[PDB]
Amino acid sequence: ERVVIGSKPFNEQYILANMIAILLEENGYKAEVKEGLGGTLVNYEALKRNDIQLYVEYTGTAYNVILRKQPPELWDQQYIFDEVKKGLLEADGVVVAAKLGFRDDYALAVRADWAEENGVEKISDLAEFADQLVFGSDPEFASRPDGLPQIKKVYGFEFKEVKQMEPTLMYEAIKNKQVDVIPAYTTDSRVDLFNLKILEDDKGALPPYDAIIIVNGNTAKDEKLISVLKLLEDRIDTDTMRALNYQYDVEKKDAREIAMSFLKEQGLVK
């Protein structure tokens, strides 16, 4: 019957899940979006359970949070993709249906004037100031293996204080000085708007986060359903995701409207 689509609680997740729901519905499936079902592992366990049949995950997240693989020497796009696609399949029967075409990385962002004034443009530079800095995390970055724990492993420091909040509130919080550092999402143009400087990950702590549609094993045997999903393969580059996200967060357009209008524009619907 219905193909239920999971989502983590932020812009592109609501947009992409809705975009997949409209496509599936144009091709004769009933679809339902569970917006903001929970974080990565709540969604992944839902997926395993078949409470949802697919959602949009990221290679680095799959690699580190879901599969708990050990970080390699150097992060390599293709290596992480292949290890994720093999590891999801072999471990849980989960299938990468599609690579959407964009990357949505975690990247440490500070207020741009603050880093102008203090001579800071890499993460290893934050070491001198970390004990003075308030980190405003999204719901996951603080505790997950590739987050603050990885910053401590590689860079050797931790922050004065850590606050946790919904992902979309990070941007306001660092604009309004309630926090001083955030794990910004690189597909969020509020990084440019609010005059933040994403810092260089100079020791290569963080993996690439390439966006993928993942589908549970049983849903993936439906070859039609998979071919509908592949209509989105390499269809949204990073710039396009940023612009679509901009529409949602800044211009406050509805997620579904954004998705439908993208899909009309691409010749995929109507």
Side-chain angles (χ1 to χ4, degrees):
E1 188 201 45
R2 235 125 85 254
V3 181
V4 183
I5 303 157
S7 136
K8 305 188 205 183
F10 56 101
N11 44 34
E12 68 204 24
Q13 292 275 318
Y14 312 135
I15 296 167
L16 290 167
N18 273 104
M19 197 194 284
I20 293 157
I22 295 165
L23 257 188
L24 281 177
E25 288 193 301
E26 283 281 293
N27 285 265
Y29 291 87
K30 317 228 192 158
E32 171 193 341
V33 181
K34 291 214 105 136
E35 268 105 358
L37 191 276
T40 125
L41 284 179
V42 168
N43 277 277
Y44 191 73
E45 296 297 343
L47 183 65
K48 277 167 67 186
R49 271 192 120 259
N50 206 205
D51 296 340
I52 63 168
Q53 279 74 57
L54 60 109
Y55 74 100
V56 169
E57 197 37 274
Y58 306 83
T59 53
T61 295
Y63 185 90
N64 296 102
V65 177
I66 296 177
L67 294 171
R68 224 302 261 161
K69 288 204 131 104
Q70 226 182 39
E73 289 196 5
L74 309 149
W75 292 113
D76 172 81
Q77 277 186 310
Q78 182 69 51
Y79 179 65
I80 301 306
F81 176 88
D82 294 326
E83 267 307 311
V84 162
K85 145 174 215 77
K86 165 218 207 166
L88 258 14
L89 180 63
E90 282 174 9
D92 294 278
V94 170
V95 167
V96 181
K99 194 157 67 117
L100 290 167
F102 70 98
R103 198 127 114 200
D104 179 9
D105 277 359
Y106 275 125
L108 263 43
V110 298
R111 263 171 326 260
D113 69 26
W114 182 87
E116 247 34 283
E117 288 159 353
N118 283 259
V120 167
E121 74 176 359
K122 347 191 220 218
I123 280 163
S124 48
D125 293 336
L126 284 176
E128 281 144 39
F129 315 89
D131 53 90
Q132 316 166 232
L133 287 161
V134 178
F135 195 92
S137 188
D138 72 353
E140 281 182 37
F141 187 88
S143 62
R144 71 188 245 181
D146 53 336
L148 284 193
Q150 181 73 347
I151 300 306
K152 174 58 179 195
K153 179 170 148 145
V154 171
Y155 293 99
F157 65 80
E158 61 285 329
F159 296 79
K160 194 181 151 133
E161 186 186 4
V162 181
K163 291 216 220 194
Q164 286 167 133
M165 65 210 75
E166 303 294 345
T168 189
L169 290 165
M170 290 185 317
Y171 301 100
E172 296 297 5
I174 195 190
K175 186 203 148 113
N176 298 158
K177 311 237 191 168
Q178 296 158 1
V179 307
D180 321 314
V181 193
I182 63 168
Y185 296 21
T186 60
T187 55
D188 207 307
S189 65
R190 293 175 291 191
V191 172
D192 287 354
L193 294 210
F194 295 178
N195 188 47
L196 311 174
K197 178 191 277 309
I198 276 169
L199 301 179
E200 169 168 333
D201 180 8
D202 61 282
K203 290 185 85 188
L206 307 185
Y209 292 88
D210 292 295
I212 50 174
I213 304 178
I214 58 168
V215 175
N216 69 211
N218 283 131
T219 307
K221 289 143 171 153
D222 186 351
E223 242 119 14
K224 195 201 197 173
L225 162 1
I226 290 301
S227 74
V228 173
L229 269 30
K230 286 196 161 298
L231 289 169
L232 301 171
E233 173 95 43
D234 290 323
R235 198 164 288 269
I236 302 115
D237 67 8
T238 293
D239 251 271
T240 290
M241 197 68 250
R242 274 213 340 152
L244 287 182
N245 278 348
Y246 179 92
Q247 310 203 294
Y248 177 80
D249 301 299
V250 176
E251 301 183 355
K252 299 253 165 210
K253 269 139 176 165
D254 185 311
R256 201 176 174 274
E257 292 183 312
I258 288 162
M260 175 91 175
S261 220
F262 181 70
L263 287 174
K264 298 229 170 178
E265 186 240 310
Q266 287 292 313
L268 292 182
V269 309
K270 207 227 73 137

